[PDB]
Design a protein around this ligand. Structure first.
Ligand code: VO4
Ligand SMILES: [Ca+2]
Ligand SMILES: [Ca+2]
Ligand SMILES: [Ca+2]
Ligand SMILES: [Cl-]
Ligand SMILES: [Cl-]
Length: 580
C-alpha cells in the first residue's frame, strides 16, 4: 500500500519526532544570510533592516522546489515568509518604534529564493548562489491583469496603478507548469491602520476586515503607505496571487489580478481537458469562499515563455456546495462553480460593480451576490496527481452556527474547533466542468474526549492518529496525501492527546491516516516540497516558541527559537513515506 511507516505517538517535546528509520536536519533558518560575505544572524535582535532584506525571512510557510535542467544534484526552492514575531525580531521585543523597525518587519516577509545542492544524498543550502534572492515587503513589483491601471489601484506614489511596493503576509503557494512560482497574500489587511482612529470604512473595506488600529502590526505610524487616511487605495494593491520566476534573480514579480483579491492561502494548479490552466484557491477567513480560475488560453507545455501572461486572461468562479446527504460520518453531495463576471449572475451596476476590475478587487462582495457557500476557513488545496480529485482543508470555524453561517453540507458542526478535509471530484474528471461531487474526506475530532458524538470526528479518526486544524496539504508522486496542522497545541480539554502540531500521511483511496511527524513547542507545521527523487521531504517549522516555550532548533541556553525549513530523509536512503 501507500503508507509504509507505523503511526507515531503524539508528542509535546521541543523537538522533531519521526517514525523509526527517519531523520531530520535544518536546511535553513530565519536570519540566514543568502549572499557571499552576508551579515550573520544576530540572536540579540540588533540586526538591521538592511541585513534582514538579504537574510532568509521569518516564519517560513508555503514553498515549492524547482529542478535545474541537466543537473539532478541542484534545485531551487521558493519559500514564503509570512509574518514576524516581534518578541524575537527586535531587541526591545515589542511593537515597532520607528521607520527602521517597520522596514525590518517588512524585510522579514515575502519570499526567499534559494539554491540547494545534493551531496551524499543530503540536500544543503548554497550560500552565495546567483539565484539566491529576497523579495520582501518593500520590493518593486508589477500589477498585471484586468485590474492593473484601474482608478482603485492608483495612489499618490503610483499614479498609473501598475507599480506596487512589496508582497507581504505570504501564506502558501502554487507551482506552474511553465516554470514559475505563485505566492499568496493572505492576512494583508492586518498591516493597515489609520492615523484617523474614527475613520469610517466603506462596505468593501469592512468586508475585508480592515481597522484603524491594525491587527497588532502597527506599521502605519511610521510608514504612511499603510495609513488608510492618506493612501486608502494601497489596501487594493495587496491580497493577490503573485507570480515569481525563480530562475531569473533580476525579474520583477507580477501580481495577477485575474485571480481575484482576497486572503489567499494557496494556489492549486490543474488543467482542463481542452488544455487551459486551472487554479483552485481558498480564502482563509471564517465564512469565506473557495474560488477557481480558468485561463482563456491553452498551456504551451513545451514553450514555457509562451505562457508568460497566461494568468492575465480567463474566468474567475466561486463555489456553492449543496446540503449533501446528511450522513454523520461521510457526508457527500454536489456543488457548482458560479462565474464572477460583470454582466452575469446579478453582478452589475445595480449590485455595486461598474466593471470587471471592481469585481476582481472586491471578489468577496461579488461572490456574496452570486450566493457562494460560506465555508469553515478554507486553507490549502491540492490536486491528486493520480486521479485529479481536489482536497481542501477547512481548518475550523468557532462561529459556525451563528446567524448567517448555518450548519450543513461540508460544514457539519456548530462551534467547529477541529476542522475537516473537503474533497471534490470534477464532473467527467474534466477540470473545465462547472459541477462536481463533494465529500468530507475526514472530519477531525477527539474520540478520547467526545466518543460517539460529532466532536469525536469521522471513523477514520482514532485516539492514535487524532489531530486538529488541518491546514497545509501536499501530494507526493506516489499519491500519498500529506496533512500539516496549525491547531491548538494545549494537549488539554478538547485537544487532549493531540500534543504539538504535526504532519500526517493519508491514503486518499481508503481514508486511512497515520501520524508521521510532531513538531517543536509553539510551532505550526507548514510548507511542503519533495526532492525530485522523493527521498527528501522538505517541511517548514513556523514560529517555534510563539508563546516563549522553545529554543528550537539550536537549543542554546535560554536561546532564541528560529523558524526553519527541515529536510526529512530515511536512514536507508529510500522514498519518504514508502515501505522499507
Ligand atoms: O496564517 V494562518 O491562517 O495558518 O494562521
Ligand atoms: Ca496556513
Ligand atoms: Ca491556519
Ligand atoms: Ca497559522
Ligand atoms: Cl450547489
Ligand atoms: Cl511557545
Amino acid at each position: 500500500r501507500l503508507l509504509g511507516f507505523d503511526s507515531i505517538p503524539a508528542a509535546t517535546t521541543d523537538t522533531i519526532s519521526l517514525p523509526k528509520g527517519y531523520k531530520s536536519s535544518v536546511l535553513i533558518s530565519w536570519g540566514q544570510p543568502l549572499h557571499k560575505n552576508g551579515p550573520a544572524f544576530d540572536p540579540s535582535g540588533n540586526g538591521t533592516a538592511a541585513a534582514q532584506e538579504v537574510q532568509f525571512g521569518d516564519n517560513n510557510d508555503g514553498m515549492s522546489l524547482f529542478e535545474f535542467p541537466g543537473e539532478k544534484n541542484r534545485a531551487l526552492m521558493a519559500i514564503n515568509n509570512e509574518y514576524t514575531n516581534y518578541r524575537y525580531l527586535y531587541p526591545h521585543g515589542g511593537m515597532p518604534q520607528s521607520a527602521e523597525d517597520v522596514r525590518k518587519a517588512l524585510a522579514c516577509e515575502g519570499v526567499s529564493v534559494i539554491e540547494v545542492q545534493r551531496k551524499n544524498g543530503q540536500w544543503q543550502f548554497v550560500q552565495g548562489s546567483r539565484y539566491n534572492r529576497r523579495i520582501h515587503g518593500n520590493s518593486p513589483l508589477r500589477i498585471s491583469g484586468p485590474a492593473a491601471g484601474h482608478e482603485l489601484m492608483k495612489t499618490s506614489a503610483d499614479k498609473h496603478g501598475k507599480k506596487v511596493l512589496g508582497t507581504f503576509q505570504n501564506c502558501a503557494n502554487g507551482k506552474t507548469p511553465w516554470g514559475t512560482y505563485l505566492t499568496c497574500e493572505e492576512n494583508f489587511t492586518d498591516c493597515f491602520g489609520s492615523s484617523n482612529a474614527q475613520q469610517q470604512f466603506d462596505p468593501a473595506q469592512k468586508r475585508y476586515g480592515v481597522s484603524a488600529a491594525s491587527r497588532e502590526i502597527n506599521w502605519h505610524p511610521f510608514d504612511p503607505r499603510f495609513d488608510m487616511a492618506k493612501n486608502p487605495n494601497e489596501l487594493n494593491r495587496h491580497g493577490w496571487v503573485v507570480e515569481i520566476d525563480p530562475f531569473d534573480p533580476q525579474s520583477t514579480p507580477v501580481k495577477r489580478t485575474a485571480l481575484g483579491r482576497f486572503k489567499h492561502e494557496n494556489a492549486a494548479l490543474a488543467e482542463t481537458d481542452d488544455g487551459r490552466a486551472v487554479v483552485y484557491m481558498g480564502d482563509d477567513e471564517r465564512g469565506e469562499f473557495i474560488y477557481k480560475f480558468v485561463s482563456r488560453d491553452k498551456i504551451n507545455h513545451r514553450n514555457a515563455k509562451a505562457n508568460r501572461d497566461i494568468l492575465d486572461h480567463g474566468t474567475l468562479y466561486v463555489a456553492r456546495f449543496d446540503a449533501g446527504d446528511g450522513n454523520p460520518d461521510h457526508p457527500k453531495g454536489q456543488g457548482q462553480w458560479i462565474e464572477l463576471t460583470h454582466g452575469k449572475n446579478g453582478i452589475d451596476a445595480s449590485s455595486g460593480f461598474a466593471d470587471q476590475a471592481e469585481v476582481l478587487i472586491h471578489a468577496r462582495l461579488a461572490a456574496s451576490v452570486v450566493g457562494a457557500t460560506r465555508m469553515d476557513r478554507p486553507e490549502w488545496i491540492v490536486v491528486s496527481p493520480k486521479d485529479g480529485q481536489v482536497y481542501c482543508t477547512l481548518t475550523n470555524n468557532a462561529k459556525r452556527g451563528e446567524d448567517g453561517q448555518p450548519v450543513g453540507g461540508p460544514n457539519p458542526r456548530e462551534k467547529n474547533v477541529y476542522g475537516q478535509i473537503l474533497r471534490w471530484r470534477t464532473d467527467r474528471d474534466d477540470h473545465a466542468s462547472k459541477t462536481f461531487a463533494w465529500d468530507l474526506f475526514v472530519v477531525a475530532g477527539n474520540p478520547s474526549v467526545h466518543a460517539g458524538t460529532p466532536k469525536g470526528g469521522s471513523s477514520n479518526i482514532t485516539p492514535q492518529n487524532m489531530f486538529n486544524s488541518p491546514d497545509g496539504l501536499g501530494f507526493d508522486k506516489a499519491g500519498r496525501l500529506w496533512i500539516l496542522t496549525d491547531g491548538d497545541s494545549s494537549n488539554a480539554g478538547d485537544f487532549a492527546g493531540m500534543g504539538n502540531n504535526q504532519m500526517l500521511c493519508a491514503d486518499p483511496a481508503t481514508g486511512e491516516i497515520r501520524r508521521f511527524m510532531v513538531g517543536p513547542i509553539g510551532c505550526e507545521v507548514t510548507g511542503i516540497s519533495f526532492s525530485p527523487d522523493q527521498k527528501t521531504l522538505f517541511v517548514g517549522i513556523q514560529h517555534p516558541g510563539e508563546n516563549g516555550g522553545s529554543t528550537f532548533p539550536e537549543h542554546l541556553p535560554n536561546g532564541k527559537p528560529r523558524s526553519s525549513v527541515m529536510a526529512i530523509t530515511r536512514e536507508d536512503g529510500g522514498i519518504v513515506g514508502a515501505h522499507h
